[PDB]
Structure formats: C-alpha cells, structure tokens
Amino acid sequence: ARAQVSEAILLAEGQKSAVTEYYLNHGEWPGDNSSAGVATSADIKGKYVQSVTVANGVITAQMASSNVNNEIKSKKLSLWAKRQNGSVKWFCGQPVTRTTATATDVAAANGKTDDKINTKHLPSTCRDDSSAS
C-alpha cells in the first residue's frame, strides 16, 4: 500500500513546477489543469494512478481502481502549498480543497471518508492535516 502511495506522490510532485510557476507569475493559484498548462487530469497517469487534478493550486492524485491494493483503490491524496511570508511550503496528505484562487487556507475535501486514503497507508511524511501551516 505505502509503496504504491509513495509512487503516486512522486507522480503528483511532477506537477508542482506548473503550479508554483503560475503562482509566481499571477499571484494566485491556477483554477484547473488547463489554466495551469498541464494535461487533462485523466491523461496524467502512471503506475497505480488514474488521474491527477489541479484545482486552485491543489494537486490531487487518484489511485487506480485495479492492480492496486484493495484498501486504496480509487482513493485520493493531495499536495498543496501555503504562503508563509514570501516563501511557500508544500504539504502532503488526505484530500483538501481551496475554494478560491486567492484563498490562503484550504478545507478538508473528504468525500464522506470514501476518497480518503487511510492514514496507515500514507507515508509518514505525507500525513499533513488540512489545517497544517
């Protein structure tokens, strides 16, 4: 499980440059994959990953539905960044959502627990809470 999740995190990290550069150039986060200049979400695939979706700067990877551990089939994790006075810090954990392109904070984006990869299956360094800062 964790081995599969760690490869999903690495794939999702491949979209960070598009998101960070957009923030650098616009002072706000990209609304979707197209505005970030990246491929459509279902075309960002890999080992164990069916899609990667950019939404207001949050990068959410969705695990594949087959050929993955039963307990993480089709579940999701997010990478997201927050301003910390000039620099930005990237976080990794359960799914989050940023409601607007300019919001500083994020909210948890659970799916009524359905989309959440269980914490036992997240690498120890990818357990950031939605409230992390």
Residue numbers in the entry: 29 to 161
Q: Can I see the authors' text?
A:
In the bloodstream an unusually tight interaction between the bacteria and the brain microvasculature endothelial cells is established, leading to cortical plaque formation that results in opening of the blood brain barrier and bacterial invasion of the brain. The interaction with CD147 is responsible for bacterial adhesion and the interaction with the β2AR induces signalling in endothelial cells.
Between α1C and the β-sheet is the αβ-loop (residues 54–76), an extended segment with a single-turn α-helix and a 310 helix that forms one edge of the globular domain. Two residues in the αβ-loop, Ser63 and Ser69, are post-translationally modified in the native PilE3940. On the opposite side of the β-sheet, the polypeptide chain exits β4 and forms a β-hairpin (β5–β6) that lies atop the β-sheet, followed by an irregular segment that protrudes from the globular domain surface then wraps under it, ending in an extended C terminus at the edge opposite the αβ-loop. Conserved disulfide-bonded cysteines at the end of β4 (Cys120) and close to the C terminus (Cys154) define the boundaries of the D-region containing the β-hairpin. The most protruding segment of the D-region, the β-hairpin loop and β6 plus the beginning of the loop that follows β6, is highly variable in sequence among N. meningitidis Type IV pilins and is referred to as the hypervariable region (residues ∼127 to 146). The β-hairpin loop hooks over the top of the β-sheet and across the β1–β2 loop; Ala129 at its apex forms a main chain hydrogen bond with Trp57 at the beginning of the αβ-loop. Not surprisingly, the Nm PilE structure is highly similar to Ng PilE, superimposing with a root mean square deviation of 3.1 Å for all main chain atoms. Since the N-terminal 54 residues are identical in both proteins the missing 29 N-terminal residues in Nm ΔN-PilE monomer are also expected to be α-helical, forming a continuous α-helix with α1C, as seen in the full-length Ng PilE structure.
